[PDB]
Design a protein around this nucleic acid. Structure first.
Ligand SMILES: N[C@@H](Cc1c[nH]c2ccccc12)C(=O)O
Ligand SMILES: [Mg+2]
Ligand SMILES: [Mg+2]
Ligand SMILES: [Mg+2]
Ligand SMILES: [Mg+2]
Ligand SMILES: [Mg+2]
Ligand SMILES: [Mg+2]
Ligand SMILES: [Mg+2]
Ligand SMILES: [Mg+2]
Ligand SMILES: [Mg+2]
Ligand SMILES: [Mg+2]
Ligand SMILES: [Mg+2]
Ligand SMILES: [Mg+2]
Ligand SMILES: [Mg+2]
Ligand SMILES: [Mg+2]
Ligand SMILES: [Mg+2]
Ligand SMILES: [Mg+2]
Ligand SMILES: [Mg+2]
Ligand SMILES: [Mg+2]
Ligand SMILES: [Mg+2]
Ligand SMILES: [Mg+2]
Ligand SMILES: [Mg+2]
Ligand SMILES: [Mg+2]
Ligand SMILES: [Mg+2]
Ligand SMILES: [Mg+2]
Ligand SMILES: [Mg+2]
Ligand SMILES: [Mg+2]
Ligand SMILES: [Mg+2]
Ligand SMILES: [Mg+2]
Ligand SMILES: [Mg+2]
Ligand SMILES: [Mg+2]
Ligand SMILES: [Mg+2]
Ligand SMILES: [Mg+2]
Ligand SMILES: [Mg+2]
Ligand SMILES: [Mg+2]
Ligand SMILES: [Mg+2]
Ligand SMILES: [Mg+2]
Lengths: 93, 16, 77, 102, 46, 63
RNA sequence: UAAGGUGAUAUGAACCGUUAUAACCGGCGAUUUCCGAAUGGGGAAACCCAGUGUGUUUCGACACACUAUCAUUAACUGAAUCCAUAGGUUAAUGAGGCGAACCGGGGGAACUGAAACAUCUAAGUACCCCGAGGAAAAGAAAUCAACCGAGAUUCCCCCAGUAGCGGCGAGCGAACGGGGAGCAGCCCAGAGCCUGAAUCAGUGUGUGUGUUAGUGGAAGCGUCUGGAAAGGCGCGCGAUACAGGGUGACAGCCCCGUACACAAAAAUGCACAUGCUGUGAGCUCGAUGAGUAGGGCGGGACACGUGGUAUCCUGUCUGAAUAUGGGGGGACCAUCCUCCAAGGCUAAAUACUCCUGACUGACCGAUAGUGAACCAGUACCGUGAGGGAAAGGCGAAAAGAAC
RNA sequence: AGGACCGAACCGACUAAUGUUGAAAAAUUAGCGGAUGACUUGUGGCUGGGGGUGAAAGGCCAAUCAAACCGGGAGAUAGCU
RNA sequence: CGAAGGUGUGCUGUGAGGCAUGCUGGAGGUAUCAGAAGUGCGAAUGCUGACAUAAGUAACGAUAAAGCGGGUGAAAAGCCCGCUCGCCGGAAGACCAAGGGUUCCUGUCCAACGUUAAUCGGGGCAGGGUGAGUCGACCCCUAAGGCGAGGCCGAAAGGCGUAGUCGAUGGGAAACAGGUUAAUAUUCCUGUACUUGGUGUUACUGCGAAGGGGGGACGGAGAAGGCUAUGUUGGCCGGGCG
RNA sequence: UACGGUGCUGAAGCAACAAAUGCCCUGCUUCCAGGAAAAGCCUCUAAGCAUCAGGUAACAUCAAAUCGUACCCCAAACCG
């Protein structure tokens, strides 16, 4: 095809979180933590194949890890990518 | 460091 | 560098000494020159950066020998 | 290998239950063992509705050392040390003092 | 008044960064010492 | 689960290969993350299974 | 090897295993993102962008592989210039970077000492640099001796703080000869015959021996005090095992060991034994290290500061003899004696410890000892180089205090 | 037209008082100079230690300057306290 | 059946000390005679830590300024809401770059941080939040300057520099008005657009460089004219009759 | 309205005068101190291709990745 079926392990988790997620459900589109190296087109494919839905276009943004806690030293979390996916019309999941 | 009067010449030099 | 391609002569450090024997570092460096040498055995000129003596060797041993050396040793030339 | 192990019946040699027999519940890689009805500590545990626990003082068994127990012979009826012999390529434990394979 | 540290990352990296450090025999000895010292930040970079 | 497929055919294996991912692994992540998957240890194996899968096949072909 | 396991803070969840595909230990494999010598180009390290090859019953764009430079060798190409070179493409090999000391080499201070300071000292030290090995270097007399003799190099003790050097100040400081450690000797400067014959390295195999997991391993009970016995007292027992650690207080006999006896599927260090590659052995007859020795000038090395100064090295200008010859014997000459420079190789006695294992201490015990007994080169300070802390102990057991 | 004039922004720093364990390791308030120029400003670059730079004061070169800072020789030497 | 250490007490020696013992402590200590030293502290403007003092003294950081009512709360001068009052308005309003790096928003808590209290916070804990063909970086292009195959030079380290290759503070295609989130928006949504390439169809045609030329492409001052932002009034619209 | 806010609906929406330091203006006038570079863009052809490929236009369609985007920013978030 263009992207091997193997590499469609880019979808990592739904981000069903906040009205941001759900209130932007009730007006098209779904959002997801997705890989890190994922290429919009590369992640559209995943959502076509798996999930078997339609997809108009996909937007991406990177979330930066909050650094916190600790006394002298310090701990940081990992960065990760957001989805915001926007399905064509016969919208299901 | 040092207080300003100690550094300052007019007050410090006082009796030559 | 100021190295004689024939003898390997290079600058060497020693001292100055005044009449009062004050030592001041200094260098003796060789009598270099760079010289177009005719080989005939290659129908060409080759410029070697050469010391006098380097020349006097070439005079005696003769160029081609000296050129066996250098090439034997890897010198560019 | 290990001398005192998991499903065994043993008799205590030292301290506060000294002489109390009991079966080994489990055996912890600290070199300790939890043996039933031997060491009892009254822990104080808060009552929990979700887990349907009554709460209040509960009784449980603490970990005693492995060297504080020895396995009960029951043919002599005393404590006994353990060795390891080979029988038919099986490394078996055996009681010392009557040499019986366990 | 204007004080001595006027931060600027471009200058920071260009003057003290890994590659700059790496571009000179002594700059490299800089790292070598810090590695031998077991330093956690060889050169304060991104 | 090792020599069980030391002899399972280079081409054939790339099947379970996908079947570990194609099914178990992707479904498991999704299902898990979404708060379903009550038996987490399934994530440990599958991943470890694919490792086996790829250990052969790599050692069978070429190496 | 195994009855228990899924590293730690760290419970919990969900699991896995019990007579052999749980875990754990060792041998050999596999995978091994990105940056970093970084090597496809770039770059503000962990990022941007390519050329060419491959890759798609959804053969676009993305993914992967390869493409740095230098050296050697070959091949093909190929100017001014026809020949020929330089230049250019490809290819095969090797290099590159890091790393504690010991080692050889290129450079090389000043404080300081002289009760000041120039000579002299500190000192060929500190430091910079280059290079290499398991050791390095040195080494098979153009050496000493003194008319008797010795017989490579290296290290140790003497000789001796002597002889000497020295603003004869401060200081520096040998050798001869003797006692020891370890000992080893060989090639090239070449052609003929005979030819791959000694040997060395690289390598495959074998064997033995060490290594990287392991196995077995003796014998204690009664009672008293106590929260707890290993302690006291009594009576037994093992000892080629009374090294040591642990366990509720001090244990040969509770545990782990210890002495002792054993063990390797695999990979390896070391010896031999051979196979393969590369290499030369052997006899006859030859050959015997020239811009060198020496000298002049300038410095430097020799304990030796130019001194009556031998000897060694050479920046500079010179320049022999060649066995009936030449070097040295501390100016120099004679005689005598003794050695053979101007090509190389060479093991041991010697040096060192980033690191592995085991063992030891009239060494420290938390302001001590490593800066660091602790998640320390950390927190912190500094643009940076760089500097650089504090901080250990509930209990036998968390029984860590329900209500 | 102008190193022209008066005068904000902007750039300076002549006087005073305050402050002097400050609000501030050099500022506040009231006045003051320049304000189309040898002006002023953001970003980035180059110059290195007996060296830099200096409309020149021995000024400045990271709150350090008649020889910067960091590490080293190093326990310099101290007929002194 | 209580070691060291700590704290008392008695005795003893010329002294440095010693012995005994109560309490504390809860595990080690060692006569004797020899042996060896990190062997004795009040001073060094010594070193480290702890704790005094001045003293509940100075001070609480611009003299723009507060008053009251009502909420919440264990508690309100300080938080929330309201009505007054006052202060900036070429800022003390608003958008960024640089720099910071979650300080943004929402719940929750008030020990420590806040020069007071604190129910509040840029403070603790947890969760959420950054959506682009068009803005910007990457990217093409170069200035200063940097690096630099070969190369020239240098005891070593290295120095300079050609071909190049990097480097913005400058050049280079293109989206606007409105809406919406607690929190982003020229990025999401509604309306209405545009830029450059690939491919296809249909017409029509000489295409073609790391090369030539053009352009991009540029100073200071000054002078008005034309014009927009923007303002004022009238008209218009809605509301008012104090 | 849970008293923070949140929904819904919705009039007129013209003219005259004034008016920038903004724009026209990278203009115009004038002066001496004489005022980046390169690419994108346009055009020209060389080697080269000549039915081809390319070039121009209309319409249709497809592509535009990646990274930044919170908040402070004359300041209680930057240097002090
Ligand atoms: N601000 C000081 C002056 C001052 C500052 N630093 C100094 C150093 C030396 C002498 C005087 C000063 C004053 O109160 O006047
Ligand atoms: Mg984005
Ligand atoms: Mg690279
Ligand atoms: Mg590179
Ligand atoms: Mg002196
Ligand atoms: Mg003789
Ligand atoms: Mg054993
Ligand atoms: Mg035993
Ligand atoms: Mg000879
Ligand atoms: Mg040698
Ligand atoms: Mg310490
Ligand atoms: Mg203590
Ligand atoms: Mg003027
Ligand atoms: Mg004026
Ligand atoms: Mg200064
Ligand atoms: Mg001193
Ligand atoms: Mg000294
Ligand atoms: Mg003691
Ligand atoms: Mg004291
Ligand atoms: Mg005293
Ligand atoms: Mg007072
Ligand atoms: Mg008073
Ligand atoms: Mg007061
Ligand atoms: Mg925070
Ligand atoms: Mg907030
Ligand atoms: Mg308070
Ligand atoms: Mg907060
Ligand atoms: Mg460029
Ligand atoms: Mg070069
Ligand atoms: Mg250069
Ligand atoms: Mg720019
Ligand atoms: Mg906002
Ligand atoms: Mg077309
Ligand atoms: Mg042009
Ligand atoms: Mg108008
Ligand atoms: Mg009225
Ligand atoms: Mg914003």
């Amino acid at each position: 095809m263009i992207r091997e079926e193997r590499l469609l392990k880019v979808l990592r988790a739904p981000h069903v979180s906040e009205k941001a997620s759900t209130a932007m459900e009730k007006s098209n589109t779904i959002v997801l933590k997705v890989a890190k190296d994922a290429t919009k087109a590369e992640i559209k494919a995943a959502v076509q194949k798996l999930f078997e839905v339609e997809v108009e276009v996909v937007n991406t943004l990177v979330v930066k890890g909050k650094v916190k806690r600790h006394g002298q030293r310090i701990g940081r979390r990992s960065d990760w990518k957001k989805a915001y996916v926007t399905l064509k019309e016969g919208q299901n999941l | 460091t040092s207080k300003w009067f100690n550094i300052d010449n007019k007050i410090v030099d006082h009796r030559p | 560098s100021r190295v004689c391609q024939v003898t390997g002569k290079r600058p060497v450090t020693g001292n100055n000494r005044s009449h009062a024997l004050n030592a001041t570092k200094r260098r003796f460096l060789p009598n270099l020159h760079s010289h177009r040498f005719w080989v005939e055995s290659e129908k060409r000129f080759v410029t070697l950066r050469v010391s006098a003596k380097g020349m006097r060797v070439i005079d005696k041993k003769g160029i081609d020998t000296v050129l066996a050396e250098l090439r034997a040793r890897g010198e560019k030339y | 290998a290990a001398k005192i192990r998991r499903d065994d019946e043993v008799i205590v040699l030292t301290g506060k239950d000294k002489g109390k027999r009991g079966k080994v519940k489990n055996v912890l890689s600290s070199g300790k063992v939890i043996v039933e009805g031997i060491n009892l500590v009254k822990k104080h545990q808060k009552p929990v509705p979700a887990l349907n626990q009554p709460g209040g003082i509960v009784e449980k068994e603490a970990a005693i050392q492995v060297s504080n127990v020895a396995i009960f012979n029951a043919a002599t009826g005393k404590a006994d040390r353990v060795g390891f012999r080979f029988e038919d390529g099986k490394k078996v434990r055996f009681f010392k003092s009557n040499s019986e394979t366990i | 008044m204007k004080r001595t540290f006027q931060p600027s990352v471009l200058k920071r990296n260009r003057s003290h960064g890994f590659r700059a450090r790496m571009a000179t025999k002594n700059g490299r000895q800089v790292l070598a010492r810090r590695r031998a010292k077991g330093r956690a930040r060889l050169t304060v970079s991104k | 689960m090792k020599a069980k497929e030391l002899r399972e055919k280079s081409v054939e294996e790339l099947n379970t290969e996908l079947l570990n991912l194609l099914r178990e692994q992707f479904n498991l992540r999704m299902q898990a993350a979404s708060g379903q998957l009550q038996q987490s240890h399934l994530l440990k194996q599958v991943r470890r299974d694919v490792a086996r899968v790829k250990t052969l096949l790599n050692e069978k072909a070429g190496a």
